[PDB]
Ligand binder design. Sequence first.
Ligand SMILES: [Zn+2]
Lengths: 104, 235, 263, 342, 104
Amino acid sequence: MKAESLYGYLKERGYSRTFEAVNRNIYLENLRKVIRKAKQSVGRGIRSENDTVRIIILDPRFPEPTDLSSKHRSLEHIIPVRFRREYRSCEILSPAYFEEDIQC
Amino acid sequence: MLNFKPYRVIMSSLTPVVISGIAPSLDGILYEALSQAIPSNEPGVVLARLKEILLFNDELGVFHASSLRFGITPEQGIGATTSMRCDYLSPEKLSTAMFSPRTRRGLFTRVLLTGGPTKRRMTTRPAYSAPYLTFDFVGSSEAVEILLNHAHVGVGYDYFSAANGEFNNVTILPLDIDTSISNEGMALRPVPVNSGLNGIKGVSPLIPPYFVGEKLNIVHPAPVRTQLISSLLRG
Amino acid sequence: MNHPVESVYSALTSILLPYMGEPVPVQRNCSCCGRAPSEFDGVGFELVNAYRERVVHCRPCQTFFVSAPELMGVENPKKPTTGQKFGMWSGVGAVINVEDNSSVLLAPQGVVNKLPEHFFDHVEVITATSGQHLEYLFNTELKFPLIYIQNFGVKTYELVRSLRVSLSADAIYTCADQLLTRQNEVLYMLDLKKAKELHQEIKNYSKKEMDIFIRTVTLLAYSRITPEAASNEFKKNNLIPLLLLLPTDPHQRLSILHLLKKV
Amino acid sequence: MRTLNFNGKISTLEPLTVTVKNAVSTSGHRLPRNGGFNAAPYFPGTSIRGTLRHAAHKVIVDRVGLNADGKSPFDLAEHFMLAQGVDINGEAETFAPGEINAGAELRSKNPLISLFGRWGLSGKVGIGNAIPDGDNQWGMFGGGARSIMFQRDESLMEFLETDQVDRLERLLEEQAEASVDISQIKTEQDALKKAMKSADKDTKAELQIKVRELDEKIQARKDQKQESRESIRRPIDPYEAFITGAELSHRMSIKNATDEEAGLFISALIRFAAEPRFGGHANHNCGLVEAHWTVTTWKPGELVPVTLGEIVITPNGVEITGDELFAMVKAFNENQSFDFTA
Amino acid sequence: MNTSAVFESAGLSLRKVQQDYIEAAAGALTQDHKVALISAETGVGKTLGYLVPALLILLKNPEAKFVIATNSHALMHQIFRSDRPLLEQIAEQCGIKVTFSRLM
DNA sequence: GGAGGCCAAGATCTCAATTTCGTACAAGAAAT
Ligand SMILES: [Zn+2]
């Protein structure tokens, strides 16, 4: 509904953007609202300076620290900056390619 | 003049990186970026302002800014690409609208693009295409982040012309140990020979820009260095 | 005087002095090497190239533009009166022993045929094409310092400006008439010591194992296989000790792999 | 003297493709990837830089205009100095290599050379690669086939005399014969590729030289064709291009820029929007772009960006925004001091 | 200015993250017809963050009344339980002693 | 009748090979 409505408005206004471009724009905007919502979710853990919260993300699409080229690379911005070290030093339940590559 | 912490900066490599023999140091990138931010081709002022955002080793004469180290992932690794500049003599470039070619019998003397001073230059340059570029440095994180994100600086050679080594997604993460100059005796940057750090002997200036000033004997690391992205993010 | 072009001149092109001619004194730096006239003793050769450009060459630089059909043979039968030129030779290599001043000319079979027998007296010519230059470097005991002009080519200005003296086997500069900037010297650096030790250690591995190693390294250097897959292949075939001898530079890896696949 | 950073997005009106020698192999035409085939391709900043340099050269020639004779005042040497940047006549200001800030006289007198340098003189305009934002924003476009016009439409055979309907029959028989022969020759060639896979090394070099003899035999069979030389019923290989409406992020920057050089760059952008074409395959209208650039600058004395305006190139028009951009353009237009000559 | 002392001298637990938000919010609210954009995560007490600036500005032309839009009882009735027993203290120390509003 | 200006030859060869984003909830109104 949003895609076709926005495409309608950009087609009557005259902007020459493809429907796929509008789909990508709405997808990015939804991703931004996803990041905001998950920032609220993480904010539900801590509410006082003495709080000590164990955040368990069971989603396989949350970006691993090591996978910096993951599609959802923005999604570590749910974590506050002040805990980003703990993001970088974290426990992974089902990690991948946990071996040692000899072409270092 | 500012407090300086050991930071490691990792950026997603968008373009192949042409290495000009010596590995591109982060201080040179920051010197280009400050040469833009405060418009200045005079080395002294840019160096002075770089010292305000980057730590400078007085006993060595070098900036606390390690050379380029490619961060290779298990999916993508260091690759051998060719940064290729080709002259494109378009039909509009070879037209009388732009210039008056020498004329004989009403015929316009064609440009000898095969050879000569008016040839189609095909400049191929070795470039290394790894998924990530990582540097280690001791300095102000906010300033270096601002420069690397909102200045026209790349890594390698001719980024201002060939757009080689374009990077994005600059991530700065704090380090526990200063790995910008030295690491277990292995030089991580162009250092003078008298420093006692072992590496590859070469001829270069220590402080940027690395193409001016007397080129003295230095010890610099392997031009192409690779580390696993996991090991780089371990810190 | 103290420049690589003088070394190659004295070693290799000093054979064409009697057809070279008396220099004409000049006041501008040689356009071919680009060096200032302070070492040319104030003299030079005035010349016009095929693009009608007024060019000054020094005693070493001019030798590449000299036509000596009676010594170097006829390069093209359609133009008999001009002979083979050192600056117009493509696919022709040369190893110049700077200290000994001796030179060996790695020419293909056609070039060897075109050369008159008088040429072989002054210059020791071995029949080898551009593919067998690395074979000659590998097998022969090189004497250092030396200048290894891999390809004389036609871009004589870029050949002279690319000339670098190879002080040892660790870094042999393969000058191939392409301008040797600091950005492309990795393609023109032949690390023969490491290549020789890697070939020595390749003997311990089977033919299939060495083919797998070469293919894996070539694909990885071209980013055709993921590093994880390449590491899996290396570990499964037990090729790690080979990998420890590889330079981290992928272009150096490709150069030494070309060297191995030639020997 | 302000470093204008233009950061912004290029939306692709018609697919954006470029042929690069390393990127294109015998496997097919691919965009430069900066890695393997799985990596994200980028439109090189070199192609955009060349396009904008050509646009700037067109601006400079139009501003200069023609002589009373109706001929451009620029000769071959000046034309190549302004277009490719290389000295052909050996007459150029060879500044000392240790002087970073050299050429101020030439930079002032020639703003095109100042923006886009010549050999021996660093330029002041740095163009970046159009980096795509998405994951599936490229694809195999074009391709298709060169259908024989007379085997598709028969109406086109009522316009040929019999002496040419027999030349059509002869060219199609030659095409079929040649394609069969080339087919079997390529089959033997691939079997030879298999024997290279073996690489038993007994006679591998000879196997390569006979492969070369086989390519020569392909060229011989393809010279025996005396009516045509190339098979007209050719399947066209697709080229890799960025999808229509692909958001590619672009960083351009003029460092230490006078108002005149910046105005010349903006006029080059304005003229480029007349034909906003990047890259090749212009037969398929490839390269038509619309791009919005946020022109920021660095605050004097601090590491902060201040926005000076936006350059919105669209098929509907160029929307220069910001009073300082207009001031730069007017400064470049009004200055009667440029001598785009020796 | 006075705000900092009247805050800490009132016994209230001023934080380092609080002062920068107080000053930025007040300075932004000085600019007429402009719009302020702030992210203040858990720990900055954004309620106080955009309340102490209101009292700094109140010193100038105190007639100016301020509207605090809210989402829901998730965040409303926290401000009721914060501004009454936290802000009124510094307001007293700052002499403001201004009256609250409910418009729900 | 010496200056352009176009055109043919020079012997050799390196190497690399692909199969589909994101799937919701609230709270809260002086109304369009
Ligand atoms: Zn010379």
